[PDB]
Amino acid sequence: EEEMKEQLKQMDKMKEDLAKTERIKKELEEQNVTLLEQKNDLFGSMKQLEDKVEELLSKNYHLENEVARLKKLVGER
Amino acid sequence: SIARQEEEMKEQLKQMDKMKEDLAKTERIKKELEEQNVTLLEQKNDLFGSMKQLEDKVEELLSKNYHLENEVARLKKLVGE
DSSP states (O other): OOOHHHHHHHHHHHHHHHHHHHHHHHHHHHHHHHHHHHHHHHHHHHHHHHHHHHHHHHEEEEHHHHHHHHHHTTTTT | OHHHHHHHHHHHHHHHHHHHHHHHHHHHHHHHHHHHHHHHHHHHHHHHHHHHHHHHHHHHHHHHHHHHHHHHHHHHHHHTO
16 A cells, blocks of 8 residues: 555656756756857857958068068168 | 556556666766866867957057058158059
8 A cells, every 4th residue: 555655756756856857958958059159159250360360461471571672762771 | 456556566667667767868968968068168268268369469460560551651652652
């Protein structure tokens, strides 16, 4: 009579434990998606900065050569 | 009702095992997710750090560019370019 209890009771605790663990799992999943998005956004920004760096290093070097050329023409130093 | 009780306890135990099995699977996925989130968080902070270093580099490159363009304009004005 009171034996089916101990098993039924245990089953209830397990049903609860499973529901809880699943909530944590769903929570971790949401965090995972949020982190992946934040990374992709960061990668994109880094790409734009890297391109900008390449663009400026190239323009500056050319400008430095031009400065050198224009200077010899005017007789500067 | 006894044969009925036992038959129910057997089924009950079968459901209990299926429950244990679903819990153990959820736990494996949980740990895998925890580890992935730790890795993602470390990479995020690293990217952030690198982004700040890149911005500082651009900031300086922009100042050199500004000065160079001023110099070239000053010179081209004298030559006639």
